């Protein structure tokens, strides 16, 4: 299947890697990325718990909310990391690590 | 009448909480969704008054 990563709007920052691999983007996760991940997951677990009290399923509701939050937070962190590696988001740390390795 | 009033006034804190939750649980209904599930929710006996105090 022929592919093309080229975006409509060009990256406004140094392009460290045009099409970074999945594991490379995951390994690029920063402290802020983990903070976003953890915040989304914790809020989602909390909403699951609180909305589960009335039907009596606070634990299962907690697991469901936590799964939704885990998927959403991982997707958000991946979004940010890959955008930094691709030059779409401000990527000072990516460029500093790239110019050295 | 004295029987139902005496029964209510002598309940303990735990039983008061149990019956408050039950009263909230059975205050309204969705018999349509119940028929979809194929279940019949029944009023718990602790929320049913004896027939001798009912208007009929």
């Amino acid at each position: 299947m022929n592919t093309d990563i080229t975006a409509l709007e060009k990256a406004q920052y140094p392009v460290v890697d045009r099409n970074p691999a999945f594991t490379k983007v995951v390994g690029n996760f920063s402290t802020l990325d983990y903070l976003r991940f953890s915040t989304i997951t914790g809020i989602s677990v909390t909403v699951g718990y609180l909305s589960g009290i009335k039907p009596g399923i606070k634990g299962p509701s907690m697991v469901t909310g936590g799964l939704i939050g885990l998927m959403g937070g991982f997707m958000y962190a991946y979004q940010n990391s890959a955008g930094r590696l691709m030059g779409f988001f401000p990527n000072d740390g990516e460029v500093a690590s790239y110019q050295k390795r | 009448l004295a029987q139902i009033h005496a029964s209510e006034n002598s309940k303990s804190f735990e039983q008061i909480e149990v019956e408050r939750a039950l009263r909230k649980k059975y205050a309204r209904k969705d018999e349509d969704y119940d028929s979809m599930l194929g279940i019949t929710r029944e009023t718990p006996p602790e929320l049913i008054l004896p027939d001798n105090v009912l208007p009929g």
Partner: protein
């Protein structure tokens, strides 16, 4: 390969979350161990969270939504116009969901599938906004429509809800068939379904004497389908009956989100394609008919929901006046009108859902509400004066344009219709203020106070309605951005 799908991250997330909620609901609603718990509010809260996370993913990934645009080109088209339209659609859906928990708990509407269908229709409208081909447009429209048919009949033992669903399915399937026939004519005549190809084929010629009648009628039938979707007269009579007969949260949802998504489609199809005058005359004549008929029919109504339905018909007439003029300011004003009408309708339906706990049905039921709940009567009076367009409330903004275009595109009969129908609308809106403030009924209805969700939403929307004209710069700038991004 994986990075290509960064352009569909919001949709992937919302669809997967919808599946998770479907499974969670069906697993624990059937559980004997938990005594078959009603899960409508639980899944509602989890779905509201899902919508907010989708909104976060979409708004924080603005440049990434245009990645791999050539690979994704034959499927959809994401740009700034779509970006802002989708953000607004997600916000509408979140507000509508937050307005449903009291209805779930007090009427004991226990079906969690309601939330699942709302989320699936939100997916469908998200795909509608980015649609860039007649095929994709039709598919997304059908997905949204099927979800609405099912939720319109959700109160399945009610005569009204079953009647609403039946009329919706028949008139909706009829209109969809007409629209599909138009797509077939365009394809047969041009050999093209992509919006870019249709643009290239149709620009520069319009009616150049030897006009393709196939193209012209494909356009006419597609326009008829769109006009049915926006409830423009004479394709409107499904709307008041479905709005009344559907459960009130369904009525609130159908009042806002589908209009945002269908107007996005109309812009990207017509404003962008190129048949020209006829297309705009269609919308001109339908706007006039909508304004007149909506004003008269609303003046005849005695029930709150019907009055709101006819008011929405009149206001889509006012909005479509903007599409008729076919200029940058026309598109900007259409978008501004849509945004303000959506916020006002959300205000009005928050109040209606609050009063539905004591079963409001007639306008006369609001008698002596200024005594029993004075701050609610003020909030509702503000909404009615805003609907009537009395400055400096937000409703004036849209009314101001109507006359600006009427004197810009050189149309004084439109101006006269606007003056007369505005006066009629003012009358039937201030009739509610008279009922709540001036009447002294013998029998009063005491209403239960609203829940926190609706009070917070009402407070925010009411502050917006009273104070928007003080700081209107962001909406003006963003709508100008969207109008420009339609072409560049």
């Amino acid at each position: 390969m994986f990075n290509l799908f960064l352009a569909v991250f919001p949709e992937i997330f919302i669809i997967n979350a919808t599946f998770i909620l479907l499974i969670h609901g069906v697993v624990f609603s059937t559980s004997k161990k938990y005594d078959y718990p009603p899960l409508a509010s639980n899944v509602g809260w989890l779905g509201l969270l899902s919508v907010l996370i989708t909104l976060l993913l979409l708004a924080a990934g603005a440049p990434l939504l245009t990645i791999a645009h050539l690979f994704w080109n034959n499927l959809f088209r994401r740009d700034n116009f779509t970006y802002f339209c989708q953000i607004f659609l997600l916000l509408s859906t979140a507000g509508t969901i937050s307005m449903c928990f009291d209805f779930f708990d007090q009427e004991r509407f226990d079906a969690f599938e309601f939330i699942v269908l709302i989320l699936l229709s939100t997916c469908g409208m998200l795909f509608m906004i980015s649609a860039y081909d007649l095929i994709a447009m039709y598919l997304a429209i059908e997905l949204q429509s099927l979800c609405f048919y099912v939720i319109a009949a959700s109160k399945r033992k009610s005569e009204f809800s079953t009647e609403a669903g039946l009329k919706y399915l028949i008139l909706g399937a009829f209109s969809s068939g007409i629209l599909l026939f138009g797509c077939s004519m365009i394809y047969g005549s041009t050999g093209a379904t992509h919006f870019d190809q249709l643009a290239k084929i149709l620009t520069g010629y319009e009616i150049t004497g030897a006009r393709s009648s196939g193209i012209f009628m494909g356009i006419l039938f597609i326009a008829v389908g769109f006009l049915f979707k926006i409830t423009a007269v004479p394709f409107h009579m499904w709307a008041p009956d479905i709005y009344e007969g559907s459960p009130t949260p369904v009525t609130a949802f159908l009042s806002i989100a589908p209009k945002i998504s269908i107007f996005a489609n109309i812009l990207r199809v017509f404003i962008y394609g190129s048949y020209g005058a006829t297309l705009q005359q269609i919308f001109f004549f339908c706007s006039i008919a909508s304004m007149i008929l909506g004003a008269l029919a609303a003046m005849a109504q005695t029930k709150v929901k019907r009055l709101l339905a006819y008011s929405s018909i009149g206001h889509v007439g006012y909005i479509c006046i903007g599409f008729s003029c076919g200029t940058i300011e026309g598109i900007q004003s259409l978008l501004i009108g849509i945004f303000i009408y959506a916020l006002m309708t959300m205000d009005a339906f928050a109040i209606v859902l609050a009063l539905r706990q004591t079963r409001v049905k007639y306008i006369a039921d609001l008698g002596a509400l200024a005594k029993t709940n004075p701050i609610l009567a003020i909030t509702f009076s503000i909404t009615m004066f805003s609907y009537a367009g009395i400055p400096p409330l937000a409703g004036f903004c849209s009314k101001f344009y109507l006359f600006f275009a009427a004197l810009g595109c050189g149309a004084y009969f439109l101006a006269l219709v606007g003056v007369v129908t505005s006066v009629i609308g003012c009358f039937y809106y201030i009739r509610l203020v008279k009922r709540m403030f001036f009447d002294t009924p013998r029998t009063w209805i005491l209403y239960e106070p609203m829940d926190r969700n609706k009070s917070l939403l009402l407070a925010m929307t009411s502050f917006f309605i009273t104070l928007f004209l003080l700081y209107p710069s962001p909406l003006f700038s963003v709508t100008h951005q969207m109008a420009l991004s339609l072409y560049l």
